[PDB]
Amino acid sequence: PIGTNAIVAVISYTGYDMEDAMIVNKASWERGFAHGSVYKSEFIDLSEKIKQGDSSLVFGIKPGDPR
Amino acid sequence: MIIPVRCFTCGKIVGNKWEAYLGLLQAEYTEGDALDALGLKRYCCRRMLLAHVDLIEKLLNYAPLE
Amino acid sequence: AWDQDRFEKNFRVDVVHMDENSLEFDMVGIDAAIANAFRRILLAEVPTMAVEKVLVYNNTSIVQDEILAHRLGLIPIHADPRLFEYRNQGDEEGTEIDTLQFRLQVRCTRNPHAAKDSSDPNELYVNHKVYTRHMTWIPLGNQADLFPEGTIRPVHDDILIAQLRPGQEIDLLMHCVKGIGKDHAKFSPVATASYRLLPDITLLEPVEGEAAEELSRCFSPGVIEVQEVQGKKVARVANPRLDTFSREIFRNEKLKKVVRLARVRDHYIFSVESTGVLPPDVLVSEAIKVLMGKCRRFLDELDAVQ
Amino acid sequence: QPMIYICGECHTENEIKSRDPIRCRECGYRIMYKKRTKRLVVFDAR
Amino acid sequence: KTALEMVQAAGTDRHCVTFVLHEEDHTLGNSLRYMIMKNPEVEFCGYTTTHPSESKINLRIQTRGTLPAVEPFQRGLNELMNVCQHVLDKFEASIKDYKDQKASRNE
Amino acid sequence: IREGELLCGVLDKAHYGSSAYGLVHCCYEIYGGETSGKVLTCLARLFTA
Numbered sequence: 117p118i119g120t121n122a123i124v125a126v127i128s129y130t131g132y133d134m135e136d137a138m139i140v141n142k143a144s145w146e147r148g149f150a151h152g153s154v155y156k157s158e159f160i161d162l163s164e165k166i167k168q169g170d171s172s173l174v175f176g177i178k179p180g181d182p183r
Numbered sequence: 184m185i186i187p188v189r190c191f192t193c194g195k196i197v198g199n200k201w202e203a204y205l206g207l208l209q210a211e212y213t214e215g216d217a218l219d220a221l222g223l224k225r226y227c228c229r230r231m232l233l234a235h236v237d238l239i240e241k242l243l244n245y246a247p248l249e
Numbered sequence: 250a251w252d253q254d255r256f257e258k259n260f261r262v263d264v265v266h267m268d269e270n271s272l273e274f275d276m277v278g279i280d281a282a283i284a285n286a287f288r289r290i291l292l293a294e295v296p297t298m299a300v301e302k303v304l305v306y307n308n309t310s311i312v313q314d315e316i317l318a319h320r321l322g323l324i325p326i327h328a329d330p331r332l333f334e335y336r337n338q339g340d341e342e343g344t345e346i347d348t349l350q351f352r353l354q355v356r357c358t359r360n361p362h363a364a365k366d367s368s369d370p371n372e373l374y375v376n377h378k379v380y381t382r383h384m385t386w387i388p389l390g391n392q393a394d395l396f397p398e399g400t401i402r403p404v405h406d407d408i409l410i411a412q413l414r415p416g417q418e419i420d421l422l423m424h425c426v427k428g429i430g431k432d433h434a435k436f437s438p439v440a441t442a443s444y445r446l447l448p449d450i451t452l453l454e455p456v457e458g459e460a461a462e463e464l465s466r467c468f469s470p471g472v473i474e475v476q477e478v479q480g481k482k483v484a485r486v487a488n489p490r491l492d493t494f495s496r497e498i499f500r501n502e503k504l505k506k507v508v509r510l511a512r513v514r515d516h517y518i519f520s521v522e523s524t525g526v527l528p529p530d531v532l533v534s535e536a537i538k539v540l541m542g543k544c545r546r547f548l549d550e551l552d553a554v555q
Numbered sequence: 556q557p558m559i560y561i562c563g564e565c566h567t568e569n570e571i572k573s574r575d576p577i578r579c580r581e582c583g584y585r586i587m588y589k590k591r592t593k594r595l596v597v598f599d600a601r
Numbered sequence: 602k603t604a605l606e607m608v609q610a611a612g613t614d615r616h617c618v619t620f621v622l623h624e625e626d627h628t629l630g631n632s633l634r635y636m637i638m639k640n641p642e643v644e645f646c647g648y649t650t651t652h653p654s655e656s657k658i659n660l661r662i663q664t665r666g667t668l669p670a671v672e673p674f675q676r677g678l679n680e681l682m683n684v685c686q687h688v689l690d691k692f693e694a695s696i697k698d699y700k701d702q703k704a705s706r707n708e
Numbered sequence: 709i710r711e712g713e714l715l716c717g718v719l720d721k722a723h724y725g726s727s728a729y730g731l732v733h734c735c736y737e738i739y740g741g742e743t744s745g746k747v748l749t750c751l752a753r754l755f756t757a
Contacts, residue, residue: 117236123192123227131756144191146434147323170574185312188323188408195440196524199407239311239412246414247566251639251680257687262695282635286628303600307593318600420593433601530696537689541682543629547622548678550605
């Protein structure tokens with residue numbers, strides 16, 4: 117299923133609504149009206165850049181700046 | 184996904200009627216009567232059950248079960 | 250002009266029903282721009298307690314953790330809002346005085362000795378529908394000396410939170426605070442709060458003959474009592490209060506003027522529906538208290554500026 | 556303590572330690588996940 | 602830490618001046634006003650909400666004679682609070698009435 | 709309108725509309741610009757409230 121229901125009342129109660137602008141109650145936007153989240157999954161390979169040795173990814177022995 | 188806690192329009196607690204909903208289902212009421220007996224009057228709370236569709240009893244099958 | 254006693258002769262508050270989490274009382278004799286103030290103060294001002302900080306240890310369920318964190322907030326604590334202070338600015342720790350502290354932990358596993366069936370998980374599982382009774386209050390400092398048992402608890406012990414399958418577990422540690430109804434929306438102590446003006450159905454003609462059929466169907470369930478002084482049904486209003494203005498009288502070209510639909514000027518009817526933090530009576534009282542206190546603040550400020 | 560991983564197709568730990576293949580030393584199939592360390596983390600719920 | 606502040610009109614003084622409350626809504630600025638209105642010495646009394654993303658209102662008060670507006674203002678506050686006091690009294694009285702009644706009904 | 713007090717007739721599309729021989733039209737010609745603009749904004753506000 118693709119979308120989520122809603123209650124419409126069609127009045128010129130604010131002026132705000134014209135040329136397709138619309139107002140949404142702030143509470144029923146806190147109560148969970150169609151909250152979203154996106155998964156972007158970047159990808160990396162260290163074989164992309166040709167370097168010497170057995171470069172693979174790991175935190176070095178060297179003390180990394182302890183942040 | 185899972186049933187939301189408080190209704191959207193007004194604010195009632197609806198995050199519990201689901202189990203008793205399926206209950207009064209097995210007792211074979213026509214849903215109009217079920218949402219009545221569950222005590223919901225203003226319709227903006229009824230369309231929260233008359234049209235919910237559960238997506239964890241169909242999404243858990245891919246569980247990394249053990 | 251204004252005069253106290255002229256008014257105070259008029260005001261009366263008739264109650265028509267109260268039970269647990271319900272209230273309905275006529276405020277006949279006040280002017281709109283005060284009733285509106287009561288309703289606003291209810292839906293926005295009676296302070297309440299709620300969850301606003303969840304700490305995660307090892308979430309390994311399908312329900313991603315951000316959404317669990319926000320799905321918690323709506324949960325109502327069943328504790329007293331009057332016995333705390335607004336959390337002093339910052340200080341995530343705070344004091345005793347500005348916090349509850351709950352805890353949730355439901356590590357799930359299989360069913361020890363299950364049959365062949367695999368019909369329902371309740372026979373196949375244990376701890377797979379994490380409810381709220383798996384939450385347990387924790388004390389801070391002298392909370393023990395302060396409160397008795399059986400109070401600090403969410404209000405229903407039935408609000409489904411998650412769903413697990415063997416191998417997955419959760420570990421939370423909440424943080425409760427105090428706030429108002431306009432800083433957010435998980436603070437409304439009531440479902441609804443409204444008022445409609447008593448409708449007043451005056452037959453500008455005596456209706457008669459066979460109109461009774463369509464009249465009785467022109468209105469709400471029981472309004473016109475068909476009355477038979479001579480076995481011949483006539484109509485009169487049983488209760489003008491029980492209607493919502495169907496206005497389904499006008500579609501009949503004839504019965505558009507033999508009746509009259511209107512409103513009595515000031516006959517408001519509140520109706521409060523509490524969640525359960527407090528029963529509606531203390532709610533109304535607290536609303537009025539905060540209005541009066543606001544006005545006192547303004548007045549004393551005007552005084553101390555001069 | 557050390558790093559842990561799980562084989563995808565059969566779900567049996569593999570614990571990559573040395574400089575070595577990336578195959579589940581039992582499970583022929585080969586693609587890996589990571590596993591969750593119990594940690595503390597702040598998360599608002601407004 | 603102001604919570605009430607007035608800016609004195611250029612045209613005249615102290616029969617037309619305009620107030621600036623803080624931290625408010627259409628609750629006070631629509632009850633207080635209706636209360637002031639009943640007073641007959643006042644000419645003009647109206648309010649607005651200067652800004653949606655802030656919460657402060659604007660109160661305008663104008664009077665026939667030469668007495669400043671502080672007097673109608675203050676008497677309005679007082680009128681309203683005494684009203685609410687009486688209302689609360691009647692409320693709780695009626696509450697306990699019907700409660701003890703309901704108990705008496707079912708005993 | 710006679711001396712700034714309308715006496716009969718509606719305000720239809722013509723006057724507050726942007727056409728020749730309108731209200732905000734003529735205000736601007738003989739008073740300046742700023743006052744015509746103020747008329748427009750204030751009249752709109754009344755019309756919303």
